[PDB]
Scaffold this active site. Structure first.
Site, PDB file in Angstrom:
ATOM      1  CD  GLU A 235      76.740  27.182  16.129  1.00 41.91           C
ATOM      2  OE1 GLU A 235      77.607  26.604  15.995  1.00 41.91           O
ATOM      3  OE2 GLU A 235      75.465  26.822  16.598  1.00 41.91           O
ATOM      4  CD  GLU A 340      72.763  27.295  13.001  1.00 40.39           C
ATOM      5  OE1 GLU A 340      73.380  28.156  12.617  1.00 40.39           O
ATOM      6  OE2 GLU A 340      73.217  26.297  12.923  1.00 40.39           O
ATOM      7  CB  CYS A 342      68.754  21.401  11.803  1.00 37.71           C
ATOM      8  SG  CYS A 342      70.486  21.266  12.044  1.00 37.71           S
ATOM      9  CG  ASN A 370      63.228  29.232  22.065  1.00 39.30           C
ATOM     10  OD1 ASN A 370      64.101  29.851  22.111  1.00 39.30           O
ATOM     11  ND2 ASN A 370      63.247  27.929  21.605  1.00 39.30           N
TER      12      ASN A 370
HETATM   13  C1  LIG Z   1      74.554  25.649  13.347  1.00 39.85           C
HETATM   14  C2  LIG Z   1      75.837  25.846  12.619  1.00 39.85           C
HETATM   15  O1  LIG Z   1      76.037  27.346  12.316  1.00 39.85           O
HETATM   16  C3  LIG Z   1      75.530  25.287  10.985  1.00 39.85           C
HETATM   17  O2  LIG Z   1      76.809  25.532  10.277  1.00 39.85           O
HETATM   18  C4  LIG Z   1      75.480  23.706  11.247  1.00 39.85           C
HETATM   19  O3  LIG Z   1      75.331  23.152  10.141  1.00 39.85           O
HETATM   20  C5  LIG Z   1      74.111  23.594  12.329  1.00 39.85           C
HETATM   21  C6  LIG Z   1      73.960  21.860  12.379  1.00 39.85           C
HETATM   22  N1  LIG Z   1      75.131  21.436  13.231  1.00 39.85           N
HETATM   23  C7  LIG Z   1      74.938  21.200  14.796  1.00 39.85           C
HETATM   24  C8  LIG Z   1      76.220  20.601  15.070  1.00 39.85           C
HETATM   25  C9  LIG Z   1      76.862  19.859  16.393  1.00 39.85           C
HETATM   26  C10 LIG Z   1      76.710  21.325  17.503  1.00 39.85           C
HETATM   27  C11 LIG Z   1      76.545  20.516  18.956  1.00 39.85           C
HETATM   28  C12 LIG Z   1      77.659  19.697  19.257  1.00 39.85           C
HETATM   29  C13 LIG Z   1      78.024  19.456  20.700  1.00 39.85           C
HETATM   30  C14 LIG Z   1      77.565  18.543  21.783  1.00 39.85           C
HETATM   31  C15 LIG Z   1      76.137  17.991  21.785  1.00 39.85           C
HETATM   32  C16 LIG Z   1      74.859  18.445  20.633  1.00 39.85           C
HETATM   33  C17 LIG Z   1      76.112  16.858  22.810  1.00 39.85           C
HETATM   34  C18 LIG Z   1      77.352  17.053  23.443  1.00 39.85           C
HETATM   35  C19 LIG Z   1      77.736  16.229  24.519  1.00 39.85           C
HETATM   36  N2  LIG Z   1      77.853  17.760  22.743  1.00 39.85           N
HETATM   37  B1  LIG Z   1      79.501  18.234  23.086  1.00 39.85           B
HETATM   38  F1  LIG Z   1      80.073  17.046  23.285  1.00 39.85           F
HETATM   39  F2  LIG Z   1      79.363  18.730  24.404  1.00 39.85           F
HETATM   40  N3  LIG Z   1      79.979  19.203  22.115  1.00 39.85           N
HETATM   41  C20 LIG Z   1      81.497  19.404  22.420  1.00 39.85           C
HETATM   42  C21 LIG Z   1      82.303  19.249  23.152  1.00 39.85           C
HETATM   43  C22 LIG Z   1      81.511  20.533  21.017  1.00 39.85           C
HETATM   44  C23 LIG Z   1      80.258  20.667  20.467  1.00 39.85           C
HETATM   45  C24 LIG Z   1      80.135  21.300  19.187  1.00 39.85           C
HETATM   46  C25 LIG Z   1      79.441  19.778  21.029  1.00 39.85           C
HETATM   47  N4  LIG Z   1      77.029  20.506  13.951  1.00 39.85           N
HETATM   48  N5  LIG Z   1      76.164  20.786  12.753  1.00 39.85           N
HETATM   49  C26 LIG Z   1      74.709  24.103  13.549  1.00 39.85           C
HETATM   50  O4  LIG Z   1      75.810  23.640  14.411  1.00 39.85           O
END
Ligand SMILES: *[C@@H]1[C@H](O)[C@@H](O)[C@H](O)[C@@H](Cn2cc(CCCCC3=C4C(C)=CC(C)=[N+]4[B-](F)(F)n4c(C)cc(C)c43)nn2)[C@H]1O
Ligand SMILES: *[C@@H]1O[C@H](CO)[C@@H](O[C@@H]2O[C@H](CO)[C@@H](O[C@@H]3O[C@H](CO)[C@@H](O)[C@H](O)[C@@H]3O)[C@H](O)[C@H]2NC(C)=O)[C@H](O)[C@H]1NC(C)=O
Ligand SMILES: *[C@@H]1O[C@H](CO)[C@@H](O[C@@H]2O[C@H](CO)[C@@H](O[C@@H]3O[C@H](CO)[C@@H](O)[C@H](O)[C@@H]3O)[C@H](O)[C@H]2NC(C)=O)[C@H](O)[C@H]1NC(C)=O
Ligand SMILES: CCn1cc(CCCCC2=C3C(C)=CC(C)=[N+]3[B-](F)(F)n3c(C)cc(C)c32)nn1
Ligand SMILES: *[C@@H]1O[C@H](CO)[C@@H](O)[C@H](O)[C@H]1NC(C)=O
Ligand SMILES: *[C@@H]1O[C@H](CO)[C@@H](O)[C@H](O)[C@H]1NC(C)=O
Ligand SMILES: *[C@@H]1O[C@H](CO)[C@@H](O)[C@H](O)[C@H]1NC(C)=O
Lengths: 497, 497
Positions: A235, A340, A342, A370
């Site tokens: 990422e 990845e 979960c 996928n």
């Molecule tokens: C993969 C990583 O490499 C692992 O280290 C980690 O444990 C794993 C699990 N994980 C997933 C997350 C969050 C990711 C997405 C967040 C995200 C979102 C989402 C899902 C909805 C909305 C709306 N947003 B968002 F607001 F647009 N937004 C912003 C602005 C930033 C992010 C990251 C998101 N955390 N741990 C995997 O990440």
């Protein structure tokens, strides 16, 4: 040979309970007689990959749903399926008794379980770690004299990976991904937050970081492990976000392009690890096709790049056709691989929902989508977590197909385990997706593949409440009369000769 | 006239303190003579839109940074700048004593303040509401006989909007956006979570939902408020996400395309509100250009769409050129407009950091980047919040340029207020962005525009710690010798004849 011992925790379905003396398992895998099919069925009601059989019949009549196999309409070859051996996963596995450890590893890696053939290996620490480290924390070690594996690798991850391999009947492929560089290589001097490598591609900072990949691969090779592939960064977009809470290293697509072209590509190419594949992106598929265009329209980058790795977290607004579909059309010879996934990571989601059928269906729905858009493999995150969804040094707790309960020397196999198993057990490396045409519109999710040997596999997921009778036509072998219960998943297999 | 009363809360800069008897203000413009420039300066060290003047010389020599206006290079015309009259914004403003309220409104809307000419009005409740409600909660009321404005509109929002319009000397444009429809029009029967309109565009549900827009505009017109524009939905992508925590209504871009073509466009066009503009998307710019292609390639949707509204939350992975740039290239007669921004919304961020210079630089950096990629306007979120960053029924607290403390009959003007003011005060509706070229690589953010009256306006932001001496050349008048201090923002004005 042994059935699910079911337990409810008050969610939509059951977990299967394993311990030191008992775990659900399969008999040796066999194809039935030419003219017979095998059905594996899992249901919200409690069936767990139950084996039944049916005749392949000469003929079929009716106006019911007909799914016709297109054996000559060929798509992508499969690489495989598996999960991530994080520090968290390794700690949770090794907290079980040795016999319970062995039943958990057999669940994932044996033909008595679901035949994983992919392990993703973090390069040093991530959020699913209890300690913040890299392999080269001694500052200004540009030649990486002080690079070395700590006990997280030598005492925890590396022995568990060898034990996994020892139980496997099919070649297991290792995939390595880094979260952060040493902090002395970074603009912000911290493992987390907004920060990239110092300087620019082609300089001492970027040559050191590419050499760190070779040092990592050298050290695992000293422990008799070889990698199938590495990713250019976990990422890379994460390191572009202010306050990013855990280990990250920011790259724009241009920075990734130039890093690969100038440092990572050549450094790997001139190593004993020249055969290790390089995957780009390793990030949300909404970054496609733009990131594929930036990196792969540079011939000097493209010649180092084997494939594009994608994460599932923003799939909700990244339609498969516009991202995976368009990337395949532009770059058909560059494989797509899901690296990845979960559930439980949203702040409004509970981290662990023991026995969640919804979370099972999220996995199988994702894998089918996928596979229908050229993806060659699908990788889970933590192989195992505790009932909190941890440990995790930033309390970023999530769910896992296996939850370990150390107090009871017990582990729970959730719906996600069986939903991933419907694919991993029955779709070996080298299987090719083939077409599967529906006679009418339907609410089912389905995919067909052909084993390297020529045998047929079809997965049918029903995310509706309604039973759906259907027929599967193999235009060359005959007809499978079946029914897809509401809240079920089936895998059908049959010899074609 | 009245300078900032500075107050530190221990962050990187100060807020300006206002109460019932004192608030910082501007003198009216003096319109300096030909050959003289005006500079307004704000610094992290505490300068707040301080006015200085200097000569413009006929000649310049040196090797330092030169910024050259290209007034013959014409780009987009500016619609304007403003913020959102949410329930929460209205409750915070009305929590002040009337004289304090009027000093807050004059700060935003008057020529003694920063000349806002845009107000975003939510159509019923969002997260920045204390009550959940729509205008038609009585179920299955398909002809919307029971549609009505509650007191959140009739006692709080509408009277404040009247007071703001009266205090403004520039015409103010109102923008309406809905978060959710009534639950009985939705697949999920809840204001939040994953759920879309029932059925398909062209059907009774979609016709009812289009009519709701006309009922809304009818009701506001009963209070002698007219709208410039409506958006097709606030963040339509949010209602595609499982468990989305607050009010939403899911559209794919296809669903938006067909809703606009079949229902919302025809229904608005066949109403007394036919001059109200329709903006599509109203969502993260990473959804461009895909969403623009899906909607605007259908001529029966395209004919109703005036513009494309963008939000800033995923800007970190959505480079301006690949999103805004590509969209303008493909669809140059379809305006781009920024409709929602705020800081503090990340889980790992404090909601409110009183005096944060970082949060000010985020606003001004975003506005410059947007203006450099054809965006015609920029809209803040809540006009005002309490020190907690609310109120907010799901405790999704964020920051706002003005923070109201009831207990002190006091409000704090944050760096974000002055960073937005450096644009809104000095760039009226009808200003045109012109070319501005740098003689060398530099760390400054800069944009040049031409006021409707022909005078020049250049904003220069320095996000670096280093002072940068520089020269601005206008071929019509000569050279401005100046300096951009580290952590400063300047607005330069001069007459061109
Ligand atoms: C993969 C990583 O490499 C692992 O280290 C980690 O444990 C794993 C699990 N994980 C997933 C997350 C969050 C990711 C997405 C967040 C995200 C979102 C989402 C899902 C909805 C909305 C709306 N947003 B968002 F607001 F647009 N937004 C912003 C602005 C930033 C992010 C990251 C998101 N955390 N741990 C995997 O990440
Ligand atoms: C590991 O898990 C296994 C599987 O649950 C445990 O074995 C089981 O032990 C329970 C308690 O003794 C047995 O329960 C009972 O079943 C009989 C009839 O089958 C019933 O008459 C009793 O009233 C009671 O419900 C269960 O049968 C038995 N199952 C198996 C497959 O042996 C085992 O004890 C656990 N091991 C450890 C170390 O905890
Ligand atoms: C509203 O805000 C204004 C601005 O902060 C408040 O004014 C400040 O009030 C204090 C208390 O009276 C003043 O203190 C004093 O200044 C004089 C010199 O002018 C000094 O001789 C006194 O001994 C004392 O230190 C302060 O100067 C004044 N500042 C300004 C700019 O007016 C005001 O009190 C606030 N009102 C309310 C009702 O909260
Ligand atoms: C090169 C391909 N390949 C095949 C296999 C399966 C056999 C694993 C055996 C093994 C090993 C080996 C081969 C090296 C080390 C340190 N351990 B080992 F010490 F990690 N180890 C433990 C702790 C248990 C075992 C069975 C084991 N592994 N890699
Ligand atoms: C780093 O490696 C060099 C070379 O072997 C060694 O002399 C030095 O003491 C090491 N430093 C550490 C482990 O901090
Ligand atoms: C809806 O409108 C009708 C008048 O057309 C009215 O008589 C009825 O009571 C309204 N329903 C509610 C619940 O207010
Ligand atoms: C809208 O179309 C209808 C026909 O359904 C017509 O009766 C009406 O006068 C039109 N109104 C406006 C304002 O265009």
């Amino acid at each position: 040979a042994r059935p699910c011992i079911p337990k409810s925790f008050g969610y939509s379905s059951v977990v299967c309970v394993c311990n030191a003396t008992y775990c659900d398992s399969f008999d040796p895998p066999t194809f039935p007689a030419l003219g017979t099919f095998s059905r594996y069925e899992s249901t919200r009601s409690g069936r767990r990959m139950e084996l039944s059989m049916g005749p392949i019949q000469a003929n079929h009549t009716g106006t019911g749903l007909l799914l016709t196999l297109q054996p000559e309409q060929k798509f992508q070859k499969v690489k495989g399926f598996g999960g991530a051996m994080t520090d968290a996963a390794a700690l949770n596995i090794l907290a079980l008794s040795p016999p319970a450890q062995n039943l958990l590893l057999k669940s994932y890696f044996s033909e008595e379980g679901i035949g994983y053939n992919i392990i993703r290996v973090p390069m040093a620490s991530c959020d699913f770690s209890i300690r913040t480290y890299t392999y080269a924390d001694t500052p200004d070690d540009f030649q990486l004299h002080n690079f070395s594996l700590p006990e997280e690798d030598t005492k925890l991850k590396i022995p568990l990976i060898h034990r996994a391999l020892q139980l496997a009947q099919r070649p297991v492929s290792l995939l390595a991904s880094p979260w952060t560089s040493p902090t002395w290589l970074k603009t912000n001097g911290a493992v987390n937050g907004k920060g990239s490598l110092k300087g620019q591609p082609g300089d001492i900072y970027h040559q050191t970081w590419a050499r760190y990949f070779v040092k990592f691969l050298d050290a695992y090779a000293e422990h008799k492990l070889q990698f199938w592939a590495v990713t250019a960064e976990n990422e890379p977009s994460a390191g572009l976000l202010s306050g990013y809470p855990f280990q990250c290293l920011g790259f724009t697509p241009e920075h990734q392009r130039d890093f690969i072209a100038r440092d990572l590509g050549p450094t790997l190419a001139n190593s004993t690890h020249h055969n290790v594949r390089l995957l780009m992106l390793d990030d949300q598929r909404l970054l496609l096709p733009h990131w594929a265009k930036v990196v792969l329209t540079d011939p000097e980058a493209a010649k180092y790049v084997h494939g594009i790795a994608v994460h599932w977290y923003l799939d909700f607004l990244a339609p498969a056709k516009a991202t995976l579909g368009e990337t395949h059309r532009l770059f058909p010879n560059t494989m797509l691989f899901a690296s990845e996934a979960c559930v439980g990571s949203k702040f409004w989601e509970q981290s662990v929902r023991l026995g969640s059928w919804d979370r099972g269906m999220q996995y199988s729905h994702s894998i089918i989508t996928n596979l229908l858009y050229h993806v060659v493999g699908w990788t889970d995150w933590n192989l195992a977590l505790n009932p909190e969804g941890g440990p995790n040094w930033v309390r970023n707790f999530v769910d896992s197909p296996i939850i370990v309960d150390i107090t009871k020397d017990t582990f729970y196999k959730q719906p996600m385990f069986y939903h991933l198993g419907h694919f991993s057990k029955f779709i070996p490396e080298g299987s090719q997706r083939v077409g599967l045409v529906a006679s009418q519109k339907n609410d089912l999710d389905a995919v067909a593949l052909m084993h390297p040997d020529g045998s047929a596999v079809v997965v049918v997921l029903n995310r509706s409440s309604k039973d759906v009778p259907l027929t599967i036509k193999d235009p060359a072998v005959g007809f499978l009369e079946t029914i897809s219960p509401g809240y079920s998943i089936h895998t059908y297999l049959w010899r074609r000769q």
